[PDB]
Symmetry: D2
Subunit: 116 residues, 4 copies
């Protein structure tokens, strides 16, 4: 996995399960092109989004569907989603973990970037 | 003042000064239309973005130019910017503060929604 | 006002009101001596803790009674309290704001240190 | 592992390596008794602190030596340490992950609690 997404629920102290995630890549015409998508597992993690070959240099947007998550639990949250936008692989291939910690009116997001 | 933005620097323990902030409103054709913008003050705050009359219900995006902020400090950042996307809802009287706490590889954002 | 405390509720998106806060100073015998205390206001803030004359260099602990706050909302929390431990340092003129952002299973704290 | 500690560096976007961690348990005389200690690995993780048998009900304090971490990297940080205080195993054995995300003037801490 060059790209992994991990989501935690700060209300429950648990992984955030079945959270939809959409990844986009900025295209040559400056539009966001769909890149990959999936749902977090029972561990809060989403693996297998992409491959080293496919995950070329670019500007990527990871959209985490936080509103849907909260609504399914009976909470009416503030944000529509969490968007994480970043340049990847500009100095060669890296491994990226995009973590998000969710509360109904607040979230944090962190990147952990390692060189394989 | 129905909408205020406040930005903090977690590395220096200080307000984040002179940070560019752009607000957008979602248009009927589903595109993001410029709405308001400014730069944070010495206190890390951006006031005067809008008025009660203009700030109607809808979907808004607040984009905080974090990357330029870090680059001005000589510190290599991860994110292109921080994006905060939410629905403004009339539910009796409301003031929205969008707070952001910035680190080079991490940020949090919180909505503080109060009735004057 | 050299020392202020501000507390936010990430679940409700609001100031955290009526939160007990105790400040301690480390004594020569290495024990924590009561220094100041109060309850956060409607704005989530606790002012008037100390004066410039009393707030001498030393090691301080700010204890925020998070557990009682959550229990008053009916929400089961993880932490007994949030503890913020730091050295006050004279380095020209300084004001310290100790900010805390609370969720049931998570909190952040930030120091905003400014020169008036 | 009934108790694991994970620490990340928000400046570098990397695990926080070789961070000292001390765990205490509140004794019958209301003093903090040493329970376990160790250092984070290359992954930012500290495993093997305790066993299910040893990790009885109680009030525990996890002290993360953040000041030492930052100073070894040439940063003069705000906090002395991060202290995480909580009741454990009050409704039976659980698995606890105590995570901390560090910046020089700010940290967040989260607990992930699972039932084996």
């Amino acid at each position: 996995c060059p790209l992994m997404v991990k989501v935690l629920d700060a209300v429950r102290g648990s992984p955030a399960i079945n959270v939809a995630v959409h990844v986009f890549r900025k295209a040559a015409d400056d539009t966001w092109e769909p890149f990959a998508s999936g749902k977090t597992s029972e561990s809060g993690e989403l693996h297998g989004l992409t491959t080293e070959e496919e995950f070329v240099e670019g500007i990527y947007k990871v959209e985490i569907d936080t509103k849907s998550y909260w609504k399914a639990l009976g909470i009416s949250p503030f944000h529509e989603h969490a968007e994480v936008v970043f340049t990847a692989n500009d100095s060669g291939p890296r491994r990226y973990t995009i973590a998000a910690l969710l509360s109904p009116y607040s979230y944090s997001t962190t990147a952990v970037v390692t060189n394989p």
